């Protein structure tokens, strides 16, 4: 599977140009609700691969992302029972939300915008927005880069 | 293999215009931002302009904004630099560079540089060089021959011996400005068994004046 | 504008020695969010375009020899070559890419190779037939393959030292033997040249207390 419980997961976005050391620059409130992210993800995933030529590795990799999120929803309920209660059953939701939860939130957005705009458009937005935050203020324009 | 090939460099009168081109190959050109960096005669490196992968975001320093325009054509795999209101302080070697941030992390600065195109902003008129042969005493094991290339403008000139055959013992002396014109020299050290028995010629090319001059080195007496 | 300052402007080292070159930024290039320094080092070998050596102040680029090491944080950075190779003869520049809205470069540090002292091979050349034909007369002296770069050339016309119309040009260090070469050119009119007979060029180098003398007479 793509998404993982690992601290520094091997090849998370590498195959699609970008890396986590680039997506990190974007704020946490920028990404929408997880349910809406997955609902609009599965929306394009089904109707594009069939019928092709529209077989893109973006929605193809999304199948290994949505199912791996399902592989966590089934896992979390089982962990918060089989062990103890304090810092064993209550810290299960605390592990996913929001650290592990943010990883999928940004991963979904990355692959969704890749089809909505273009892999290059996203990679360009990711580079230019990072460039915007890095710039020492005042010499930096106040108008932040947008994705449209 | 990543190749960046700049073209367009020339002698331009102050206040003039010039358009530089850079042909890129060996990478997905539309995935990378591109920049122009110039190297002045003092050997200082100066950032001129950047353009994002798509052509959406454009950046300029205070020295060039309003006079220079960076552009790209992702369909022709070309980067452009339209320079206008040219001034003498714009005289430099212009490099086309590929921005690396686009490969993955922000960690990456510009990674590949092209070979450059020299731009000369001057009112001094383009003058072709005068090539003089330097031929010699009781000849030792080796003889030193030379070529004096005098009174050309602008820089540069290329001197080749036996049209590239004689490469190993060549010395190219940097040009010096004398009375508003350049002068340079070149030397070859050949075995005494090869000269004057075999023919030694220096070929001087001044691309600015579309000049090529081949001078045969002959002995004296 | 973050100004980049490099020291020393140049330095000579012998093959196998450790080299340290310094870079100073007018303000910090450390991110504090990333906790990464936005500093790069480029190497420019003679007749070539720059090549990226180090990024994030300490990380080597793909294909960069292990001898190259970058260190420092905030405003003070260094590039270390431990140990030097003759191939490492280049100008090393530092670059800050924090801004990206105004990228800056350091002035560069010129790395030269220290070698065993070598005396010049001197050659004198009288004006060519075709040059005299045009009304000018240039006498040339080549001082080839010496070490160090410091050399003196005096021109003597019939015993008297001349100091008008002399241009000297040095070659950059040799890629093969790490030596320097220099060309001295005495420029006179055909008339000024014809008025005298003995033309001498004397070279003074660290290698000998006696000048290397080369001359010719119009006979």
UniProtKB/TrEMBL annotation, chain A:
Molecular function as annotated in GO: DNA binding; RNA binding; structural molecule activity
Disulfide bonds: 1-68
The keyword Acetylation is assigned to this record: no
One cellular component (GO) term of this entry: T=4 icosahedral viral capsid
Presence of the UniProt keyword Chaperone in the record: no
Chain ranges passing through the membrane: none
Coiled coil: none
Main localization category: secreted
Keyword annotations of the record: Capsid protein, Cytoplasmic inwards viral transport, DNA-binding, Host cytoplasm, Host-virus interaction, Microtubular inwards viral transport, Phosphoprotein, Repeat, RNA-binding, T=4 icosahedral capsid protein, Viral immunoevasion, Viral penetration into host nucleus, Virion, Virus entry into host cell
UniProt signal peptide: none
Example of a GO biological process term: viral penetration into host nucleus
PTM info: Cleaved by host furin.
Family of this protein: Belongs to the orthohepadnavirus core antigen family. Belongs to the orthohepadnavirus precore antigen family.
Protein role: Self assembles to form an icosahedral capsid. Most capsids appear to be large particles with an icosahedral symmetry of T=4 and consist of 240 copies of capsid protein, though a fraction forms smaller T=3 particles consisting of 180 capsid proteins. Entering capsids are transported along microtubules to the nucleus. Phosphorylation of the capsid is thought to induce exposure of nuclear localization signal in the C-terminal portion of the capsid protein that allows binding to the nuclear pore complex via the importin (karyopherin-) alpha and beta.
Subunit structure: Homodimerizes, then multimerizes. Interacts with cytosol exposed regions of viral L glycoprotein present in the reticulum-to-Golgi compartment. Interacts with human FLNB. Phosphorylated form interacts with host importin alpha; this interaction depends on the exposure of the NLS, which itself depends upon genome maturation and/or phosphorylation of the capsid protein. Interacts with host NUP153.
Protein name listed in UniProt: Capsid protein
Biological source species: Hepatitis B virus (HBV)
Parent-record interval covered: 23 to 170 of 212
